[PDB]
Symmetry: D2
Subunit: 229 residues, 4 copies
Amino acid sequence: ARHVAWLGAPRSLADLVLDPPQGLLVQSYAPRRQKHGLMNADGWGAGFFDDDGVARRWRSDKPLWGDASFASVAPALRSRCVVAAVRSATIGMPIEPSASAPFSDGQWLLSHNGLVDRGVLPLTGAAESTVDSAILAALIFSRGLDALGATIAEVGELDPNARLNILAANGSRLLATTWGDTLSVLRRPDGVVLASEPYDDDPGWSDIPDRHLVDVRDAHVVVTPLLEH
Amino acid sequence: ARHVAWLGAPRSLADLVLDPPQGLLVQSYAPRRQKHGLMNADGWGAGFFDDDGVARRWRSDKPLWGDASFASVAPALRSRCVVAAVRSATIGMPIEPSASAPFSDGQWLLSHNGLVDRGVLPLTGAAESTVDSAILAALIFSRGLDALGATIAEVGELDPNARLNILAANGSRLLATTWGDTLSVLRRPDGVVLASEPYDDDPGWSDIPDRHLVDVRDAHVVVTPLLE
Amino acid sequence: ARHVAWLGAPRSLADLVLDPPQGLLVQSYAPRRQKHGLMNADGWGAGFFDDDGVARRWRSDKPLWGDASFASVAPALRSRCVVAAVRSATIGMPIEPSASAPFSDGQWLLSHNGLVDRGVLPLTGAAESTVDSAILAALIFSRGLDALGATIAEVGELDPNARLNILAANGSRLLATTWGDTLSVLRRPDGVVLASEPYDDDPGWSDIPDRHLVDVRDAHVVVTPLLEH
Amino acid sequence: ARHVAWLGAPRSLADLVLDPPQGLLVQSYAPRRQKHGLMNADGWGAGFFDDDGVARRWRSDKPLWGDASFASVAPALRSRCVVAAVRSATIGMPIEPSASAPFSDGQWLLSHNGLVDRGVLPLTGAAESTVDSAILAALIFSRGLDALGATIAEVGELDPNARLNILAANGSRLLATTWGDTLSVLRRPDGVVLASEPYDDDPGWSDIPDRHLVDVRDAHVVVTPLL
Ligand SMILES: C[N+](C)(C)[C@@H](Cc1c[nH]c([S@@](=O)C[C@H](NC(=O)CC[C@H]([NH3+])C(=O)O)C(=O)O)n1)C(=O)O
Ligand SMILES: C[N+](C)(C)[C@@H](Cc1c[nH]c([S@@](=O)C[C@H](NC(=O)CC[C@H]([NH3+])C(=O)O)C(=O)O)n1)C(=O)O
Ligand SMILES: C[N+](C)(C)[C@@H](Cc1c[nH]c([S@@](=O)C[C@H](NC(=O)CC[C@H]([NH3+])C(=O)O)C(=O)O)n1)C(=O)O
Ligand SMILES: C[N+](C)(C)[C@@H](Cc1c[nH]c([S@@](=O)C[C@H](NC(=O)CC[C@H]([NH3+])C(=O)O)C(=O)O)n1)C(=O)O
């Protein structure tokens, strides 16, 4: 999987996801910094907050590059806060829009890049899908996003093989973790991007070190360490 | 099929298509004035013009009522000019979003409710799909929407069993034909609705007689007969 | 929802599902004895057991009537034991093949016609989907099909508003419950059909009364009541 | 696109398409001999002839690798004659099962790997989709498969940039053309495979030269240049 998020002045979904020369559209078939999986063709999702702060989501189980509707409509959807993703799944896992990030609890949008043993996670009746990312999202939402660092550090200890890159947003804040996969940040005059990988060659891109939490709010960017055992 | 169009002040796709008590969402499974087909569950589409006049379209091969993405996003999509439809197809016909109205030539959005023998229509290399409505749309676009009434009269004489209800828009105009199926008009304070059937029980709804052309601009509604 | 099952000498999926004049194909848009939902256009599924006893499944999130692939291929798929369904879901529920019956635990195929409050069911890590029927299937599989009648009575007391029509098969047995919806049986010389409603007007169809269990094995059809509350 | 065909003793769709270590399933995300397109994730199809000679088809607009239904059912579908394909399309082209090979006229199954300018082909009302492969399939069916070589030779001159790899079958015959893309043949004891590329490293695989017709029946493989 690859994901991208925006917090700042209104930006179109197309401008963030489709239009950049190495953005999510390109990453669906030719990602640059992806160690696990060749591509991200098992679905996609784009979530945003409208003027009234309502979380809205377009999700699909198809390759992003072939979605003519999104290509047509995305330029007309603008938001101060966006989380989008393209999905990669091991052969045999369920293909369904409910399994594509971003997940939502109504307040937060959330994407997971990685893998986790569902056996170490609590059972839940609140997940959007059966896929590991949805079970993990349910746990994260249950604990609260203010506790994201704790949740990820804990799950990372329960499953030493897990990769736990989270990217989340609530309309006025971004949260992310690096735990076994990539993330970069771009600070623009008008807002902040977090992305699995840079969507162009802007010299402003900087890479987030592994095992960190990123917290973006009030024009501040915090990159702070997570607990390791 | 059932379709609906809006021309007026900015209106959300949800407000036009999903929210009314008997609007297109409800018509996908329980239409009230549909003589042909039980439902409209073979796909859907919603086209609109953005602030720069660009025609944009969301189309699907699935039942409208089940599309969680559209239900979530439609309230955030607002436009002065919308054409939307829900598709019904006889069993065996191809199911694919390219076959769902509205069709487009970049300037005009167009929906067809009815049936026409592709055998009487010209062959084309410009259709979006193989289905009869797409072949008919290609013809209509080729003749130009200013000739819509004449084109429909022509096709109607070529295929006396054809039903040829067209609903089209270019961002500042609506055009529609009645030819064998239903159409109604609602004049609101802020714009005009044209629809296969009323989306509620507003007393302002009036029915368009069969074999007529409807022309809407700047909330002016002109209804004229088609050629005999 | 409507479902149908077969146990006997081999019959093709088309023969059971598509070809009868009032079979599952027709029921996807024009059911005859369906009190809840106008139609069954939210997906479909056909499960069968092959010659080696392996459970195989074709599932979809599309209306059965439009599925050109199934219409083409179904006549070539023959089995001694079949469970098939067409899905109907209330607006807003997840549309995905994993949510379409039949569900499977590898030994049993299972379809549910009705609805149940997921809040009264146990949490599980074994569900195929988040839909209520999948959570219910997980419970049924966990309790064992030999306890089906008792499990359904129990759930029926936990949720007095639930409808709990189950149809299940393991290659050599059918099991079914009536709990708020319809079921009929047809005894042919070559096997037994159980179905939500008759797929034709054969006078041989018999209706199963509500709140009963049906057990088909060794060419015997045994119908028994369920527990009192 | 990549395609594969079988003519011989009954073989399951899974055995031909899913199970080989470098078969169509793998080619959907990691083809080995494909110059055009990185993958074949824009749909798939598997056509076969049943015991009574009826042509049947399963087609999809999704990536082959993710189709749980096909993975489950394919081992139970056996046939003496199969044509299957995975589709690749440039970004923006219609995604729809009607556009996925194999196409059919009821007698013949047909797959096209390549590209052709629809502008040089006759208009048609008989195509299954609007995509160039479907327009070409319509022309080929119209002319008749007994004329496949002549039709492909003609279209290849009408459009000197066209790539026109056809793989077709009627239950008792395979026909194929090489015209700008790859094709290999494997002769097994129980039948013949034709494929865009070898599905394993069997030493029996041999490559068909470009601009040739391949005609398979009665376990004879006749390879001739196109006239
Ligand atoms: C289907 N295929 C195209 C072959 C995929 C197969 C694949 C293998 N590994 C991957 S990874 O990108 C996904 C992997 N995690 C998972 O598969 C678990 C499911 C994932 N959380 C999900 O959202 O489905 C990871 O991020 O480590 N994809 C590809 O190569 O992209
Ligand atoms: C698939 N099914 C649910 C059984 C349908 C079958 C059906 C029969 N007739 C209809 S009508 O709404 C469509 C009919 N026209 C066509 O089928 C030609 C194709 C149509 N123009 C289209 O856009 O696909 C018409 O408008 O007179 N649907 C239904 O009952 O709605
Ligand atoms: C979407 N729509 C076409 C409007 C449907 C809406 C509807 C209302 N009630 C029904 S019923 O067939 C389903 C209802 N149960 C549910 O919706 C729970 C989910 C169901 N178990 C499932 O498999 O999704 C029941 O069986 O009592 N469908 C229809 O009328 O068929
Ligand atoms: C969508 N994407 C994943 C980026 C594709 C883009 C792509 C570029 N070129 C190709 S090729 O495999 C298809 C190309 N022909 C066409 O695109 C015409 C349409 C094709 N006949 C079809 O059946 O759709 C060819 O065979 O030379 N795919 C990929 O890289 O596989």
